[PDB]
UniProtKB/Swiss-Prot annotation:
<feature type="domain" description="Lipoprotein-associated type-17">
    <location>
        <begin position="12"/>
        <end position="106"/>
    </location>
</feature>
<protein>
    <recommendedName>
        <fullName>Membrane-associated lipoprotein</fullName>
    </recommendedName>
</protein>
Length: 120
């Protein structure tokens, strides 16, 4: 169908697949702060794999702040997606961290509950 090692280097959000969180079914990426996603994906992630579904399986197993703390992520509207990629031919599982931006952001990194990065 297509060699896996050629399609894995092409996995990109909004292209190959999209995700929707069980906690925010009707909200786009740009209306969600990275911190909101990080604190609510435990409710469930629905993957919409648009391409390569014959050859590959894409799962987001963890959402991580690029630098380890929400303020930094909320400022850049960025997240580090920890992925699990299954090669459907051989059935081997591969892991890959992918950094994506385009999520809601605010200049100081304050979160959805008013918390300020580093204060208190």
């Amino acid at each position: 169908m297509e060699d896996f090692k050629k399609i894995v280097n092409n996995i990109r959000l909004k292209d190959t697949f999209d995700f929707k969180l069980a906690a925010f079914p009707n909200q786009n990426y740009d209306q969600l702060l990275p911190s909101q996603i990080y604190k609510n994906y435990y409710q469930g992630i629905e993957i919409q794999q648009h391409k390569y579904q014959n050859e590959l399986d894409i799962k987001i197993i963890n959402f991580l702040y690029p630098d380890g703390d929400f303020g930094s992520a909320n400022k850049n509207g960025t997240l580090k997606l920890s992925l699990m990629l299954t090669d459907k031919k051989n059935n081997q599982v591969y892991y890959k961290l992918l950094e994506v931006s385009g999520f809601k952001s605010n200049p100081y990194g304050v979160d959805e509950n008013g918390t300020i990065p580093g204060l208190e």
